[PDB]
Amino acid sequence: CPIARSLERVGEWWSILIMRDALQGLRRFDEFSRSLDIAPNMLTRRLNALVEAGLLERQPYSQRPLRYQYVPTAKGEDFRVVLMAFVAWGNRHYAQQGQSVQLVERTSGRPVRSFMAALADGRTVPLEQCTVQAGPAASEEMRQRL
């Protein structure tokens, strides 16, 4: 479908699906395989890359054969925002009826129109109104890059 294609093109589709399932409690290689309908060799490469990226950590599960489960890391827990963003990105310019994947309010089924930025004072502004800039701790090199 269109959002899978965009997300594959940008290299995040499987990471999004696996991270999502890991954050929902899936742990064992076979859980991932059956639930995501993904071939083993590819599941393995994608798990290892999530691990190398520091988003999941492998932890012993059993002895003979020694098998591992995959549990999210504090970073991976935080990565939820990024995954959600990739979907809002992928759904940009697609009408809601028709969408195969949606960012919604978990309580109702209410779809998310857009991300907003919450400032310290209470106010919410659109992202178009925000910018990436150098921070107080930034080196000379960082300042130049920004």
Question: Which residues, 2 to 31, sit near Na ion by CB under 5 A?
Answer: 8, 13-14
Q: Does 139 bind its own copies (CB under 8 A)?
A: yes
Please tell me whether residue 98 binds its own copies under the rule CB under 8 A: yes
The answer to the question of residue 79 lying near Na ion (CB under 5 A) is: no
- Compare residues 71 and 85 and give the one whose CB is closer to its own copies: 85
The first and second tokens of residue 71, run together, are 């549990």
Report d(CA 21, CA 56) in Å as an integer. Answer: 12
| Distance of closest approach, residue 89 Cβ to its own copies, in angstroms | 5
Given Na ion, its own copies, none, residue 41, with its beta carbon under 5 to 8 Å by kind, binds: none
Binds its own copies (CB under 8 A): choice among 39, 41, 52, 63: 52
Helix (H, G, I), strand (E, B) or coil at 14: helix
Q: Which does 67 bind (CB under 5 to 8 A by kind): its own copies, Na ion, none?
A: none
H/E element, 99: none
By the rule CB under 8 A, 22 interacts with its own copies:
no
Q: 103: number of CA atoms within 13 Å, CB side?
A: 20
In 3D space, the residue among 80, 83, 18 whose CA is nearest the CA of residue 47 turns out to be 18
Q: Which is closer to Na ion, CB of 15 or CB of 69?
A: 15
Cα 104–chain centre separation: 15
Give yes or no for residue 96 binding its own copies (CB under 8 A).
yes
Sign of CA dihedral 91, 89, 7, 102: negative
The residue to which tokens 């990471």 are assigned = 15
Query: Contact positions toward Na ion, by CB under 5 A?
Result: 8, 13-14
